Amino acid sequence: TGDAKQAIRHFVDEAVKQVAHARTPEIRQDAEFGRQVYEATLCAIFSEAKDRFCMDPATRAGNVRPAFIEALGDAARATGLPGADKQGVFTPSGAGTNPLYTEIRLRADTLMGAELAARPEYRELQPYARQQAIDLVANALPAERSNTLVEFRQTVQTLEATYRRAAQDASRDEKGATNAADGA
Numbered sequence: 001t002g003d004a005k006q007a008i009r010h011f012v013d014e015a016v017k018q019v020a021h022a023r024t025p026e027i028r029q030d031a032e033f034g035r036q037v038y039e040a041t042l043c044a045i046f047s048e049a050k051d052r053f054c055m056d057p058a059t060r061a062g063n064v065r066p067a068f069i070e071a072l073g074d075a076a077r078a079t080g081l082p083g084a085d086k087q088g089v090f091t092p093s094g095a096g097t098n099p100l101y102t103e104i105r106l107r108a109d110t111l112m113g114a115e116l117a118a119r120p121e122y123r124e125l126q127p128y129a130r131q132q133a134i135d136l137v138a139n140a141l142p143a144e145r146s147n148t149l150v151e152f153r154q155t156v157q158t159l160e161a162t163y164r165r166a167a168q169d170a171s172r173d174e175k176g177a178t179n180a181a182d183g184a
Contacts (some may be wrong), residue, residue, distance in 0.1 A: 001115055003026050003121070003122045004077050004112075004115075004116035004117070004119040004121040004122055004125075005125070007183040008114070008116045008121075008122060008125060009119065009128050010184050011108045011126055012104065012105070012108075012112075012125075012128060012139075013128075013129070013132065014078055014108070014130040015103075015104035015105070015107040015108045016104050016129055016132045016136075017128075018104075018107070019100050019103050019104045019107070020100070020133075020136045023079070023100060024136070026142075027139070027140045029135075031140055032073045034137060034139075034140030034141070034150060035140065035141065037099045037100065037137045037140075038137050038138070038141060038151040039082065040083065040095060040098050040099040040101075040136050041099055041101055041133070042076065042079055042081055042148075042149065042152055043081070043092050043095055043096050043122075043136055043151060044096050044097060044098075044099065044101050044102060045083065045152060045156055046072060046076050046081070046092055046096065046146075046156075047092070047094070047096025047097070047150065048096060048157075048162060049068075049072055050068065050069065050158045051096075052123065052126075052158060053065060053068045053163065053164070056123075056164055056167070057149075058164065058167040058171050059163070059164060059167045063167045063170070064163045064166060064167050067163065068159065068160075068163050070158065071159050071163070072090065072159060073090055075151070075152050075156065076092070076152060077090055077160070078148075078151070078152075079148045079151070079152050080148075086114070086163075093108060094117065099137075100136070100137075101129075101130070101133045101134075101145075102134060104129060105129070108129070117135055122129040124161075126156075126157060126160075127154070127157055130153055131153070133151040134150070135155060137149070143167065
């Protein structure tokens, strides 16, 4: 309860190191699966991004989800994700979870499964673990692909905060007042 802002943040850090060290030898020894992770890593952000937006109580339906999907796909496209084009809509086949990012999140989840995880501070704290987790994957890759993860990662954060805020703006704007304020 002290401050999930710094607490959960540091707990996730421990997972990242432990796991990073766990499979780091394989990336060096088998510098081939790291590249596969790069694609899945983005997928996790892509899939999680939608889930986070969808889960939010102020963006449950028709609020800005369709738009979030379109904007999310646009940035995830610039990355050049080898997804699948269906009926003109470009969307990844799935596999949001599966790599190290998934493994580190679960570990930190168990320790912080307390009130910390229940605090809203948790939602914004998205780019802390990702910044370190994506860095390791980007390690097996040049500075190029690395920029891609950084670009998409911030873009999502910006899209989410902007879209989430936009939804809240309309919520506060439409709050229980205006509507039931006819008798004002």
